[PDB]
PDB file of C-alpha atoms and ligand atoms in Angstrom:
ATOM      1  CA  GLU Q   4     -30.696   3.819 -24.041  1.00 38.46           C
ATOM      2  CA  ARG Q   5     -33.070   2.393 -21.460  1.00 38.51           C
ATOM      3  CA  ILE Q   6     -31.125   4.973 -19.494  1.00 40.16           C
ATOM      4  CA  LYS Q   7     -32.227   7.699 -21.908  1.00 39.14           C
ATOM      5  CA  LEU Q   8     -35.792   6.538 -21.248  1.00 38.97           C
ATOM      6  CA  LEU Q   9     -35.648   7.828 -17.664  1.00 38.82           C
ATOM      7  CA  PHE Q  10     -32.617  10.132 -17.478  1.00 38.21           C
ATOM      8  CA  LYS Q  11     -31.160  13.266 -19.009  1.00 40.53           C
ATOM      9  CA  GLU Q  12     -28.158  11.458 -20.514  1.00 38.66           C
ATOM     10  CA  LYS Q  13     -25.750  14.407 -20.571  1.00 36.88           C
ATOM     11  CA  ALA Q  14     -26.407  15.524 -16.989  1.00 35.35           C
ATOM     12  CA  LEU Q  15     -26.292  11.917 -15.804  1.00 35.43           C
ATOM     13  CA  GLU Q  16     -22.902  11.228 -17.327  1.00 32.08           C
ATOM     14  CA  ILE Q  17     -21.506  14.439 -15.802  1.00 29.92           C
ATOM     15  CA  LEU Q  18     -22.744  13.468 -12.326  1.00 30.99           C
ATOM     16  CA  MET Q  19     -21.480   9.883 -12.547  1.00 32.11           C
ATOM     17  CA  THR Q  20     -18.126  11.075 -13.909  1.00 30.22           C
ATOM     18  CA  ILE Q  21     -17.705  13.245 -10.828  1.00 27.31           C
ATOM     19  CA  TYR Q  22     -18.752  10.331  -8.631  1.00 27.12           C
ATOM     20  CA  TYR Q  23     -16.311   7.752 -10.038  1.00 26.11           C
ATOM     21  CA  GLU Q  24     -13.428  10.212 -10.326  1.00 26.09           C
ATOM     22  CA  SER Q  25     -13.725  11.350  -6.695  1.00 25.31           C
ATOM     23  CA  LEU Q  26     -14.253   7.773  -5.504  1.00 23.79           C
ATOM     24  CA  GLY Q  27     -10.976   6.812  -7.166  1.00 22.15           C
ATOM     25  CA  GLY Q  28      -9.172   9.558  -5.247  1.00 25.38           C
ATOM     26  CA  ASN Q  29      -8.824  12.297  -7.857  1.00 25.84           C
ATOM     27  CA  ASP Q  30      -9.609  15.958  -7.427  1.00 23.12           C
ATOM     28  CA  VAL Q  31     -12.239  16.436 -10.110  1.00 23.44           C
ATOM     29  CA  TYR Q  32     -11.318  19.079 -12.676  1.00 17.90           C
ATOM     30  CA  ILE Q  33     -13.911  20.526 -14.986  1.00 15.61           C
ATOM     31  CA  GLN Q  34     -11.549  19.885 -17.919  1.00 12.85           C
ATOM     32  CA  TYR Q  35     -11.371  16.233 -17.000  1.00 13.14           C
ATOM     33  CA  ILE Q  36     -15.160  15.877 -16.940  1.00 16.39           C
ATOM     34  CA  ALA Q  37     -15.255  17.397 -20.416  1.00 15.86           C
ATOM     35  CA  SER Q  38     -12.720  14.884 -21.762  1.00 15.41           C
ATOM     36  CA  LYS Q  39     -14.875  12.036 -20.430  1.00 15.82           C
ATOM     37  CA  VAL Q  40     -18.355  13.103 -21.502  1.00 15.34           C
ATOM     38  CA  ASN Q  41     -19.785  14.024 -24.907  1.00 15.94           C
ATOM     39  CA  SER Q  42     -20.391  17.713 -24.149  1.00 16.55           C
ATOM     40  CA  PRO Q  43     -18.574  20.965 -24.954  1.00 18.44           C
ATOM     41  CA  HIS Q  44     -16.835  22.706 -22.045  1.00 16.35           C
ATOM     42  CA  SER Q  45     -19.504  25.396 -21.889  1.00 18.03           C
ATOM     43  CA  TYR Q  46     -22.315  22.841 -21.531  1.00 18.87           C
ATOM     44  CA  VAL Q  47     -20.456  21.034 -18.762  1.00 20.89           C
ATOM     45  CA  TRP Q  48     -20.027  24.359 -16.979  1.00 18.13           C
ATOM     46  CA  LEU Q  49     -23.769  25.069 -17.326  1.00 19.40           C
ATOM     47  CA  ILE Q  50     -24.721  21.691 -15.851  1.00 20.39           C
ATOM     48  CA  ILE Q  51     -22.192  22.084 -13.003  1.00 18.00           C
ATOM     49  CA  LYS Q  52     -23.812  25.417 -12.100  1.00 18.68           C
ATOM     50  CA  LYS Q  53     -27.234  23.751 -12.051  1.00 17.34           C
ATOM     51  CA  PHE Q  54     -25.877  21.005  -9.783  1.00 17.80           C
ATOM     52  CA  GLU Q  55     -24.405  23.704  -7.560  1.00 14.12           C
ATOM     53  CA  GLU Q  56     -27.812  25.434  -7.396  1.00 15.69           C
ATOM     54  CA  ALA Q  57     -29.322  22.091  -6.375  1.00 15.39           C
ATOM     55  CA  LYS Q  58     -26.699  21.802  -3.607  1.00 15.05           C
ATOM     56  CA  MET Q  59     -25.352  18.575  -5.160  1.00 12.51           C
ATOM     57  CA  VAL Q  60     -21.843  19.885  -5.907  1.00 12.29           C
ATOM     58  CA  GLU Q  61     -19.586  22.652  -4.740  1.00 14.63           C
ATOM     59  CA  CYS Q  62     -16.864  24.112  -6.890  1.00 12.03           C
ATOM     60  CA  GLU Q  63     -13.854  26.254  -6.250  1.00 12.85           C
ATOM     61  CA  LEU Q  64     -10.991  27.793  -8.170  1.00 14.21           C
ATOM     62  CA  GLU Q  65      -7.451  26.615  -7.629  1.00 15.50           C
ATOM     63  CA  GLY Q  66      -5.541  29.188  -9.652  1.00 14.94           C
ATOM     64  CA  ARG Q  67      -7.006  28.869 -13.151  1.00 19.96           C
ATOM     65  CA  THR Q  68      -8.346  25.353 -12.433  1.00 18.31           C
ATOM     66  CA  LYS Q  69     -11.987  24.726 -11.538  1.00 23.03           C
ATOM     67  CA  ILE Q  70     -12.386  21.893  -9.043  1.00 24.91           C
ATOM     68  CA  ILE Q  71     -15.739  20.207  -8.450  1.00 23.95           C
ATOM     69  CA  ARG Q  72     -16.723  18.124  -5.416  1.00 27.72           C
ATOM     70  CA  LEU Q  73     -19.958  16.279  -4.562  1.00 26.65           C
ATOM     71  CA  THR Q  74     -21.830  17.422  -1.479  1.00 25.10           C
ATOM     72  CA  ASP Q  75     -23.197  14.707   0.796  1.00 23.62           C
ATOM     73  CA  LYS Q  76     -26.487  15.218  -1.049  1.00 23.98           C
ATOM     74  CA  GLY Q  77     -24.886  14.844  -4.479  1.00 23.52           C
ATOM     75  CA  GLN Q  78     -23.044  11.750  -3.298  1.00 24.52           C
ATOM     76  CA  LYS Q  79     -26.205   9.985  -2.075  1.00 26.03           C
ATOM     77  CA  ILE Q  80     -27.975  10.717  -5.346  1.00 25.61           C
ATOM     78  CA  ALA Q  81     -25.074   9.412  -7.463  1.00 22.59           C
ATOM     79  CA  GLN Q  82     -24.963   6.251  -5.363  1.00 24.09           C
ATOM     80  CA  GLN Q  83     -28.661   5.607  -5.898  1.00 23.51           C
ATOM     81  CA  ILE Q  84     -28.358   6.241  -9.635  1.00 22.19           C
ATOM     82  CA  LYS Q  85     -25.475   3.753  -9.739  1.00 21.12           C
ATOM     83  CA  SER Q  86     -27.834   1.081  -8.392  1.00 22.13           C
ATOM     84  CA  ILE Q  87     -30.555   1.997 -10.918  1.00 20.87           C
ATOM     85  CA  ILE Q  88     -28.038   1.708 -13.746  1.00 20.02           C
ATOM     86  CA  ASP Q  89     -26.948  -1.708 -12.416  1.00 24.30           C
ATOM     87  CA  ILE Q  90     -30.603  -2.843 -12.163  1.00 27.40           C
ATOM     88  CA  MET Q  91     -31.446  -1.575 -15.654  1.00 31.69           C
ATOM     89  CA  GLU Q  92     -28.517  -3.457 -17.203  1.00 31.45           C
ATOM     90  CA  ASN Q  93     -29.178  -6.771 -15.451  1.00 30.07           C
ATOM     91  CA  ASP Q  94     -32.019  -8.852 -16.906  1.00 34.55           C
TER      92      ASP Q  94
ATOM     93  CA  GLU P   4     -37.240  21.107 -11.448  1.00 34.04           C
ATOM     94  CA  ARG P   5     -34.072  19.789  -9.850  1.00 33.77           C
ATOM     95  CA  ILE P   6     -35.850  16.634 -10.941  1.00 36.27           C
ATOM     96  CA  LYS P   7     -35.892  17.857 -14.542  1.00 34.47           C
ATOM     97  CA  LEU P   8     -32.134  18.352 -14.187  1.00 34.67           C
ATOM     98  CA  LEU P   9     -31.561  14.588 -14.003  1.00 32.32           C
ATOM     99  CA  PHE P  10     -34.787  12.956 -15.212  1.00 35.13           C
ATOM    100  CA  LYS P  11     -37.102  12.785 -18.195  1.00 34.54           C
ATOM    101  CA  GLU P  12     -40.038  14.367 -16.346  1.00 31.33           C
ATOM    102  CA  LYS P  13     -42.844  12.792 -18.381  1.00 32.77           C
ATOM    103  CA  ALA P  14     -41.482   9.237 -18.251  1.00 29.10           C
ATOM    104  CA  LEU P  15     -40.670   9.645 -14.562  1.00 27.45           C
ATOM    105  CA  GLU P  16     -44.170  10.715 -13.620  1.00 24.33           C
ATOM    106  CA  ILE P  17     -45.649   7.788 -15.578  1.00 27.25           C
ATOM    107  CA  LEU P  18     -43.406   5.289 -13.768  1.00 26.07           C
ATOM    108  CA  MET P  19     -44.055   6.751 -10.312  1.00 24.70           C
ATOM    109  CA  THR P  20     -47.800   6.907 -11.004  1.00 29.75           C
ATOM    110  CA  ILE P  21     -47.771   3.183 -11.718  1.00 30.19           C
ATOM    111  CA  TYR P  22     -45.711   2.597  -8.583  1.00 29.41           C
ATOM    112  CA  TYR P  23     -47.957   4.504  -6.154  1.00 27.07           C
ATOM    113  CA  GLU P  24     -51.191   3.258  -7.713  1.00 28.74           C
ATOM    114  CA  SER P  25     -50.161  -0.411  -7.489  1.00 26.84           C
ATOM    115  CA  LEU P  26     -48.742   0.088  -3.992  1.00 28.06           C
ATOM    116  CA  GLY P  27     -52.124   1.414  -2.887  1.00 28.22           C
ATOM    117  CA  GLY P  28     -53.809  -1.742  -4.180  1.00 24.92           C
ATOM    118  CA  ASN P  29     -55.283  -0.595  -7.489  1.00 23.28           C
ATOM    119  CA  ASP P  30     -55.048  -2.358 -10.813  1.00 25.68           C
ATOM    120  CA  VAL P  31     -53.325   0.294 -12.897  1.00 28.22           C
ATOM    121  CA  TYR P  32     -55.314   1.344 -15.955  1.00 23.73           C
ATOM    122  CA  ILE P  33     -53.694   3.255 -18.761  1.00 24.32           C
ATOM    123  CA  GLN P  34     -56.590   5.743 -18.640  1.00 24.15           C
ATOM    124  CA  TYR P  35     -55.900   6.396 -14.993  1.00 26.82           C
ATOM    125  CA  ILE P  36     -52.222   7.134 -15.633  1.00 27.30           C
ATOM    126  CA  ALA P  37     -53.291   9.634 -18.282  1.00 28.67           C
ATOM    127  CA  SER P  38     -55.622  11.444 -15.864  1.00 30.59           C
ATOM    128  CA  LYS P  39     -52.744  11.794 -13.390  1.00 30.56           C
ATOM    129  CA  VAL P  40     -49.894  12.905 -15.637  1.00 30.34           C
ATOM    130  CA  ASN P  41     -49.574  15.815 -18.068  1.00 33.54           C
ATOM    131  CA  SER P  42     -49.429  13.719 -21.251  1.00 34.27           C
ATOM    132  CA  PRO P  43     -51.919  12.788 -23.983  1.00 33.77           C
ATOM    133  CA  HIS P  44     -53.114   9.171 -24.034  1.00 32.20           C
ATOM    134  CA  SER P  45     -50.994   8.376 -27.076  1.00 34.39           C
ATOM    135  CA  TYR P  46     -47.794   9.587 -25.388  1.00 35.69           C
ATOM    136  CA  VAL P  47     -48.536   7.539 -22.284  1.00 39.43           C
ATOM    137  CA  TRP P  48     -49.048   4.499 -24.501  1.00 40.82           C
ATOM    138  CA  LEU P  49     -45.701   5.152 -26.232  1.00 42.33           C
ATOM    139  CA  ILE P  50     -43.839   5.388 -22.919  1.00 38.58           C
ATOM    140  CA  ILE P  51     -45.572   2.247 -21.582  1.00 35.46           C
ATOM    141  CA  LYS P  52     -44.365   0.340 -24.656  1.00 35.46           C
ATOM    142  CA  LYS P  53     -40.816   1.565 -24.034  1.00 33.96           C
ATOM    143  CA  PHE P  54     -41.050   0.437 -20.401  1.00 32.01           C
ATOM    144  CA  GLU P  55     -42.333  -2.916 -21.627  1.00 30.39           C
ATOM    145  CA  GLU P  56     -39.346  -3.196 -24.000  1.00 30.69           C
ATOM    146  CA  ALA P  57     -37.077  -2.474 -21.028  1.00 32.09           C
ATOM    147  CA  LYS P  58     -38.805  -5.279 -19.084  1.00 33.91           C
ATOM    148  CA  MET P  59     -39.938  -2.787 -16.411  1.00 29.65           C
ATOM    149  CA  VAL P  60     -43.691  -3.256 -16.945  1.00 27.63           C
ATOM    150  CA  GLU P  61     -46.005  -5.825 -18.413  1.00 26.57           C
ATOM    151  CA  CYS P  62     -49.398  -4.966 -19.795  1.00 25.98           C
ATOM    152  CA  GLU P  63     -52.458  -6.935 -20.700  1.00 22.66           C
ATOM    153  CA  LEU P  64     -55.940  -6.339 -22.033  1.00 24.94           C
ATOM    154  CA  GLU P  65     -58.965  -6.939 -19.864  1.00 22.19           C
ATOM    155  CA  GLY P  66     -61.743  -6.515 -22.407  1.00 19.64           C
ATOM    156  CA  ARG P  67     -61.203  -3.002 -23.771  1.00 16.93           C
ATOM    157  CA  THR P  68     -59.144  -1.967 -20.712  1.00 18.67           C
ATOM    158  CA  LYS P  69     -55.344  -1.890 -20.769  1.00 21.75           C
ATOM    159  CA  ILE P  70     -53.836  -2.886 -17.431  1.00 20.40           C
ATOM    160  CA  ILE P  71     -50.209  -2.151 -16.576  1.00 25.80           C
ATOM    161  CA  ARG P  72     -48.131  -3.840 -13.864  1.00 27.27           C
ATOM    162  CA  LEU P  73     -44.521  -3.293 -12.741  1.00 26.44           C
ATOM    163  CA  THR P  74     -42.137  -6.204 -13.129  1.00 26.67           C
ATOM    164  CA  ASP P  75     -39.786  -6.888 -10.228  1.00 26.83           C
ATOM    165  CA  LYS P  76     -37.223  -4.888 -12.207  1.00 27.01           C
ATOM    166  CA  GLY P  77     -39.570  -1.937 -12.704  1.00 26.63           C
ATOM    167  CA  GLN P  78     -40.489  -2.031  -9.028  1.00 31.00           C
ATOM    168  CA  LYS P  79     -36.867  -1.860  -7.824  1.00 30.36           C
ATOM    169  CA  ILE P  80     -36.155   1.067 -10.126  1.00 29.16           C
ATOM    170  CA  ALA P  81     -39.240   3.006  -8.975  1.00 30.94           C
ATOM    171  CA  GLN P  82     -38.264   2.412  -5.355  1.00 31.41           C
ATOM    172  CA  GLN P  83     -34.777   3.786  -5.931  1.00 30.22           C
ATOM    173  CA  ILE P  84     -36.141   6.816  -7.778  1.00 34.00           C
ATOM    174  CA  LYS P  85     -38.486   7.446  -4.841  1.00 34.14           C
ATOM    175  CA  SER P  86     -35.440   7.744  -2.572  1.00 37.89           C
ATOM    176  CA  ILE P  87     -33.664  10.090  -5.014  1.00 39.22           C
ATOM    177  CA  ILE P  88     -36.740  12.311  -5.131  1.00 38.94           C
ATOM    178  CA  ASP P  89     -36.850  12.345  -1.308  1.00 39.32           C
ATOM    179  CA  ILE P  90     -33.117  13.209  -1.147  1.00 41.18           C
ATOM    180  CA  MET P  91     -33.436  15.953  -3.769  1.00 40.28           C
ATOM    181  CA  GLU P  92     -36.302  17.617  -1.888  1.00 39.34           C
ATOM    182  CA  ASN P  93     -34.656  17.529   1.543  1.00 37.54           C
ATOM    183  CA  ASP P  94     -31.978  20.172   2.140  1.00 36.82           C
TER     184      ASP P  94
HETATM  185 CL1   CL X   1     -10.026  15.640  -2.781  1.00 39.43          CL
HETATM  186 CL1   CL X   2     -21.582  18.280   2.245  1.00 34.81          CL
HETATM  187 CL1   CL X   3     -53.393  -6.313  -8.948  1.00 33.77          CL
HETATM  188 CL1   CL X   4     -41.554  -9.934 -12.481  1.00 34.36          CL
END
């Protein structure tokens, strides 16, 4: 909510979902991101393409499965956002 | 624009305006923030109140002049956003 004050909530949760899922050791599937966030599949896809345009993620097809990975740039950004979230939540 | 992808552009520019103005040594006046950002005075005031609620700024009246200052919390957040902006702009 203080988060909504500064961030686009939907795009943020997509980015951080990719971050935590990859950090945990999972290949990140677009379907998985959808199950975790409050957006329809088509909206997730749209945001992923925007991230790709911004050189923050790369995606590739493995058969019928879309896999998303953070670029070094996307990773740094997610890490910094993680700290902002921490700071915002700690009074 | 990649900024708009993740951030609320209007709130962001208000926060960073406070950050750079204070860093330069100015008392930050609400009127000044308005001259720098693309928002009407009343919208700036609304955002400032939200920041105040989030304990990121404090404001006070000096006569008829509203002065805004970042709290330690607001300062840390602005600093982290500064790095994100830098990262986003450097390919
Ligand atoms: Cl992997
Ligand atoms: Cl990379
Ligand atoms: Cl001062
Ligand atoms: Cl303080």
